[PDB]
Structure formats: structure tokens, C-alpha cells
Amino acid sequence: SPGIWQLDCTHLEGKVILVAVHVASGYIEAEVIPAETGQETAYFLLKLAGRWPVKTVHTDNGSNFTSTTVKAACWWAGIKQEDGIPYNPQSQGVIESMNKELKKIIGQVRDQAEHLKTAVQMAVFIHNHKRKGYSAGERIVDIIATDIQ
Amino acid sequence: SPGIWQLDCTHLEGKVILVAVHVASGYIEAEVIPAETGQETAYFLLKLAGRWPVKTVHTDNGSNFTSTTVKAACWWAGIKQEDGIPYNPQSQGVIESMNKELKKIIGQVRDQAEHLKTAVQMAVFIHNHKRKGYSAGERIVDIIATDIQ
Numbered sequence A, B: 001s002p003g004i005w006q007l008d009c010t011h012l013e014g015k016v017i018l019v020a021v022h023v024a025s026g027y028i029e030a031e032v033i034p035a036e037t038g039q040e041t042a043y044f045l046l047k048l049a050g051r052w053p054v055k056t057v058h059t060d061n062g063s064n065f066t067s068t069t070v071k072a073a074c075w076w077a078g079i080k081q082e083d084g085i086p087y088n089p090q091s092q093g094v095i096e097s098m099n100k101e102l103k104k105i106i107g108q109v110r111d112q113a114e115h116l117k118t119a120v121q122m123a124v125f126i127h128n129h130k131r132k133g134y135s136a137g138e139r140i141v142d143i144i145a146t147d148i149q
């Protein structure tokens, strides 16, 4: 569980926000892309796995699960690519709720920046620092550190 | 010192590689940009501070130290902006040594990817996972987790 992440793709302002969620902590990383392609997904996963110990990725849809570039990047980075099928049905809803919450945050900061990509990174910042009392950033670090010991 | 980072800018293939090093661990994040402007630097710092608890950054030169956009981002993200003058002279050399090693890694993977930005991210991955036996990615997580408790 410390190495498990879920991909999520959501849409805003005619663009795509790609999100990776660290399932046990709720910590996220995100980027704005013009469209979700295998190549963009593969590059996002290489960035993520260079930053955190990514063991398994639950992919967000079958096109990315199938994509040969995604599979090349998972092989390169040592990642086990799995489906993201919500076998525990509370999954569809957790992700939907996360997308809702992110977009709400983006709307709270949207006026402070011109580019959507800046507002998305502000929202990443606010989500990961929010006290829930630990934050997601604190949880992911404690989870992986406990794992290291 | 768990919250201290150093920015570093280096050049390759007529492009700029912007690097943030977590001083205590050697862990890095990096990006390729066409040129090192305040706006790119500010955006890079926002991304970094949304992913790790960045308390202080030693900026890589006086133009970023001065940049009003950089200072706006440091204010937004709660980051103390400092100079990066090597008062400990071994700093000039440690950074030079890092740039040399990164470029070496890049040259080792350069042929596996078409875009420079992909090879840079492969090199981030190899650097942060290399055991020297803890890796930089392991050190940074242990350092911050110790700090959390």
C-alpha cells in the first residue's frame, strides 16, 4: 500500500487535468495537458516515479492501460500497471468527490493566476497542505518512512 | 535543514535545465525550459512547494533573487527566499559536480528518448534511486519524517 497510486483524469476549461493520487494518504500530483494521450500519460508517470517510490499504478481507463507508450514507461520505471476497476464500488465516488474538491479549489484561486496550469498547481499545494490532525503531505512521508524502517 | 532547497540552472542542447536540490539529502526535481525567466522559476517553485515542505530556497542567481514574480510565488507558497552565495566555498564545486553528473546520466539515457525533457526525467529518476546504502529519495523521506515527529 505505500507504493500504490491511482491515475485520474478530469476536464476543465476545455483542457485536461491529469492527477495521480497516493491512495493511502490522499496526497496528489497533477498537470494540465491539452488532451490525455498515451505519450502524455507515460511522461507524467515517469515524472511521478522519479519523485516517489511508485510500485503500482491503477490506470484511469483502458486506453492508457493498453497504450504501448504507457506500458514502455511503466517497464522503464519499474511500475506494475494495473486496471483501475473499482472492485470496491466506493472508488467511483471517492474519485468523483476528489475531482469536485479540486475544481472547487481551482475556482477559489482561479482569479490569482492567468494560466489554468498555475491555478492547478496552487490547488495541488492547498490540497496537500490541508489539515484533516495531519495533512496529506505529512501522511505520505510518514507512510513511506515507516515502510523504509 | 529538512526544509532547505537550492536552485541550480544548467544548459544543454541550447535549452535550460532547472534543478531544485534538497540540500540535506541530494534528492532533486528538474525541468527543461526554453530559458530561465522569473515566470518559469516562479512556476517551478510553486510546483516544488506543493509536493515537498519547502521552507527556504537558496536562489541560483540575482535575477531570480530580484524577480518580482519569483518573490510573489515565494510569498504565496510560504517560502523564505535567500541568496545562494557559497559562503561555504565547497558549494560552487558541489553544484558543478552535480551538473556534471546529471549531464553524464542524461548522456547515458539520451538515445532512449526523442525529447530532452524525457531524458532529463529519466536522469532525475536514476539520480534519486541510486544507492550510495540509502538513496536520495530514501534520505529525503527519512529526514522529513524525523522532522514531523
Ligand SMILES: O=C1C(=O)N(Cc2ccc3c(c2C(=O)O)OCCO3)c2ccc(Br)cc21
Binding pocket: A021, A022, A023, A024, A025, A026, A027, A028, A094, A095, A097, A098, A099, A101, A102, A103, A105, A127, A136
Ligand atoms: O476529497 C478528496 C479525496 O477524497 N481525496 C482522495 C483520497 C483518497 C484516499 C484517501 C484520502 C483521500 C483524501 O481525502 O484526499 O484521504 C485519506 C487517505 O485515503 C482527495 C484528493 C485530492 C483532492 Br483536491 C480532494 C480529495
Ligand SMILES: O=C1C(=O)N(Cc2ccc3c(c2C(=O)O)OCCO3)c2ccc(Br)cc21
Binding pocket: A112, A113, A114, A115, A118, A122, B039, B042, B043, B046, B069, B072, B073, B074, B076, B077
Ligand atoms: O498568480 C500567479 C501568476 O500570475 N503566475 C505567474 C505569471 C506571471 C505573469 C503571467 C502569467 C503568469 C501565470 O499565470 O502563469 O500568465 C501569463 C501572463 O503573465 C504565478 C507563478 C507562481 C505563482 Br504562486 C503564482 C503565479
Ligand SMILES: O=C1C(=O)N(Cc2ccc3c(c2C(=O)O)OCCO3)c2ccc(Br)cc21
Binding pocket: B021, B022, B023, B024, B025, B026, B027, B028, B094, B095, B097, B098, B099, B101, B102, B105, B127, B136
Ligand atoms: O553528485 C551530486 C551531488 O553532489 N548531489 C547534490 C548533493 C548535495 C548535497 C548532498 C548530497 C548531494 C548529492 O550527492 O546528491 O548528497 C548527500 C546530501 O548532501 C547531486 C544531486 C544530483 C545529481 Br544528478 C548529482 C549530484
Ligand SMILES: O=C1C(=O)N(Cc2ccc3c(c2C(=O)O)OCCO3)c2ccc(Br)cc21
Binding pocket: A039, A042, A043, A046, A069, A072, A073, A074, A076, A077, B112, B113, B114, B115, B118, B122
Ligand atoms: O523513451 C521514451 C520516449 O521515447 N517517450 C515517449 C515518447 C513517445 C513518442 C515520441 C516521443 C516521446 C518522448 O521522447 O517524449 O517524442 C516525440 C516523438 O514521439 C517516453 C515517455 C516515458 C518514458 Br520512461 C520513456 C519514454
